[PDB]
């Protein structure tokens, strides 16, 4: 009879603004194409940004946790990876120039973790930049030279533009991987640039298309579900009504686990008023964001650009990014710039919003 | 499509260990696995019960035949030992307890044939305890005459025209059965194999380059039987002598009356007198079977009713093999039995011809 996962798991993992290191821009794009895919399969999905050595460490060990016995495990990693005496390792965003194992987490000894768990499927698939039945992907591909042509920017990485047309596939894990090997050496174009490397233990037909075990309210499935919906929990949508008359929509939209974009449009304003501008300001400091992004006429200009289908037109948008960086609760201004018809005097209101810990910051671990 | 510019393979199975437990699954095992290879029209290079320097000088030979496009399949069978993540192959003269320095370093194997340009290398360890296309295997699941796991499931599907990691994810599949490995992780699979290869690709156009002649003198040099003899003794007693291979470190022995005079009522030849160097226990010599020598792989295609003697570790030999056959015959009435003695110079057979 058909295999089948207890549940599906996933933590995918971006790095792309890196302190002391060259900055990446395939891992937004990849993060955000395979948390879809995978959704498509039936995986409830973690897809972190930039994320510190701190942060890596709390995001993995507490993913691991989510492997109980038949779960169907993924983790992603993209960004910057290094080797050293035959072992990997993962390079966080604030890792000191040169790397450090220290620093770094260590791809090994995950690989030994996911050894201890009775997991149904674990893929841990690695696309970095120089019985558990685990499969582990390596793929390594050389960093832009200085003087090579920018191409798309929205473009996809090497490996993940030939993983994302094989991975809805009916097809064993293993199986499907090996095409993706072969696909990347039938591409002369690539040949040169990207290599893949794929480890395997699994011994038996599982893939990542197998359907969930019955619907089984266990408490331990209801763990895994209260920690994957705590952690992606939305602000609802804000009716704010000014003395004035004047009032303000608030909507919040996720783009990434600790990526929210909040946006602001003048949904009712009396026959009085003639002029009317809204705007948000003062943020958390540990949010860090500088107002020259926020308030833009369009998601791109915030560099907002995959969400940016999804999001209601005509508003103001602010991109919230490194939202596990926010200690204390998401605090923040709504202001009004108004005129009465006649009148030369610009008018000023304001009213302070508290929309708790959204997303990935709900997590007080 | 996809061709070999040669095929190569190397076959080490460690059995008889002087300070660690015996193993007898290495002997059928690297046995099967050279006649499946053969089959595939690969030379083949087959050694039992090696010490460190002599795996070392195989291994390190081995890898000196892997030019472009040359296929090659490295087996090792026996113990294995892993220390932080490294894995080694454990030789026959090991100390109790081992150490990584007596051992011979898997990743460094991997590594030296990383910096290869062959069409396909085929790395398989099956363990108790231009790019390269490397296809690694690592099984750790190691009566009598039995196989082993691994090699269970892999003689059933190593001649199927499919790609080597394909074919190897089906014995991993395979092996998820057998009640001795249900649900354990006793396969692990590593692969850089991008290519459609096979181990049945076929052979490209034989050429006649000194490269091509150095990888088949080098096989041919080391697999030398001596030819069969006929001794004739001065009693007009004639004795034939054969001589089989079992292994490329591995020759079997056989003798029978061939001729004997109406003058001569009984008679008994006998194989005596080896090199020290080879440690032939008497007692194990001249039996009536192969089976009883601990030799039944190549029992089906020795000749019938004659005495066998198994000489193994021919590696050992440093001087030629020279022995004596020896004769015990009665003559008719007579009381007295009349003793004869011939000795024998076969050169350095198989393996000991490399020195
Ligand atoms: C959300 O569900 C959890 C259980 C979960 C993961 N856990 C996390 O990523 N955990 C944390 C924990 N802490 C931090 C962190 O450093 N801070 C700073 C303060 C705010 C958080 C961060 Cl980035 C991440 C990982 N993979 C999956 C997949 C599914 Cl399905 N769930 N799942
Ligand atoms: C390149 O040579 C050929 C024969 C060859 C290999 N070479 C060896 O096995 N070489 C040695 C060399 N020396 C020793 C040894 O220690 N002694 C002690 C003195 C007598 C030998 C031993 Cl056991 C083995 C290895 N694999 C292959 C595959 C094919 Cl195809 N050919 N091939
Ligand atoms: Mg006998
Ligand atoms: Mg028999």
Known sequence: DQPLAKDKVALLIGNMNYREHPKLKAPLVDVYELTNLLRQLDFKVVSLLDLTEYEMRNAVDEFLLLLDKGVYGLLYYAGHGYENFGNSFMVPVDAPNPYRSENCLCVQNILKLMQEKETGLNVFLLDMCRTANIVFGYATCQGAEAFEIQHSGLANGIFMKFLKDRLLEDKKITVLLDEVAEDMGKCHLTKGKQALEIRSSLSEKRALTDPIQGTEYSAESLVRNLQWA??????????????????????????????????????????????????????????????????????????????????????????????????????????????????????EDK???????????????
């Open 351 to 365: 009213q302070e919003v508290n929309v708790g810990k959204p997303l990935i910051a709900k997590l007080d671990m």
């Open 230 to 347: 705590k952690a992606h929990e939305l602000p609802e949508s804000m009716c704010l009504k000014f003395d004035c008359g004047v009032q303000i929509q608030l909507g919040f939209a996720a783009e990434f686990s600790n990526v929210m974009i909040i946006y602001t449009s003048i949904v009712y304003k009396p026959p009085e008023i003639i002029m009317c501008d809204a705007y948000v300001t003062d943020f958390p400091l540990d949010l860090d964001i500088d107002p020259k992004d926020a308030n833009k006429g369009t998601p791109e200009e915030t560099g907002s650009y995959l969400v940016s289908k999804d999001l209601p037109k005509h508003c103001l948008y602010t991109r919230l990014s490194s939202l596990q960086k926010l200690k204390e609760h998401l605090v923040f201004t709504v202001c009004l710039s108004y005129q009465y018809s006649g009148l030369e005097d610009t008018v």
